[PDB]
Amino acid sequence: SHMNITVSGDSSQLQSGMGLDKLIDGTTSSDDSSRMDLKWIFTSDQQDKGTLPFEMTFEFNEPKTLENFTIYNRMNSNGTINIAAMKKVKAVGYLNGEEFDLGEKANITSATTVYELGGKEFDKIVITALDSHKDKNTLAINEIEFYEKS
Numbered sequence: 001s002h003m004n005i006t007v008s009g010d011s012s013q014l015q016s017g018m019g020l021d022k023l024i025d026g027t028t029s030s031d032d033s034s035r036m037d038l039k040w041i042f043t044s045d046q047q048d049k050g051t052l053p054f055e056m057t058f059e060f061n062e063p064k065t066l067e068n069f070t071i072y073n074r075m076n077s078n079g080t081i082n083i084a085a086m087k088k089v090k091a092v093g094y095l096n097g098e099e100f101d102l103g104e105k106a107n108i109t110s111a112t113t114v115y116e117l118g119g120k121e122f123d124k125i126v127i128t129a130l131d132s133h134k135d136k137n138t139l140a141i142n143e144i145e146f147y148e149k150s
């Protein structure tokens with residue numbers, strides 16, 4: 001049906017008003033109001049910054065069998081990937097403490113990054129943004145969606 005997801009991670013890395021909740025608020029557009037962003041850089045001497053790698057933890061209140069999860073990347077209006085978007089990501093799944101390497105996806109250029117899970121069962125998934133298209137202090141993600149196996 002509808003699947004309750006809890007997201008956690010270091011909110012001190014993120015831009016005000018653009019926190020972890022924006023990963024699961026049901027907004028997949030690239031608008032500022034939809035996204036989770038690492039702290040924006042406002043001045044040339046700013047020392048308060050977020051840094052990659054950035055780890056995002058997703059938990060379900062009970063194990064779920066998943067078809068996939070889908071990361072929605074920040075895109076420009078012309079369909080090209082924005083400079084602040086994710087470029088490289090890895091993920092790990094857990095079930096009863098057992099750890100499962102879900103692998104890394106690199107050179108991301110598309111509107112979505114999809115981890116096909118083929119009905120594997122997890123109670124926790126940890127997604128780590130490793131690189132963006134700009135620098136290690138920049139990251140924008142529109143949404144991350146989880147699709148349950150029937």
Ligand SMILES: CC(=O)N[C@@H]1[C@@H](O)[C@@H](O)[C@@H](CO)O[C@H]1O
Pocket residue numbers: 037039040041042084138140
């Ligand atoms: C118009 C535009 O793209 N503004 C971006 C902002 O969205 C965010 O990425 C910020 C991070 O420092 O940098 C700006 O360049």
Ligand SMILES: [Ca+2]
Pocket residue numbers: 022023024025026027028034035036142143
């Ligand atoms: Ca969103």
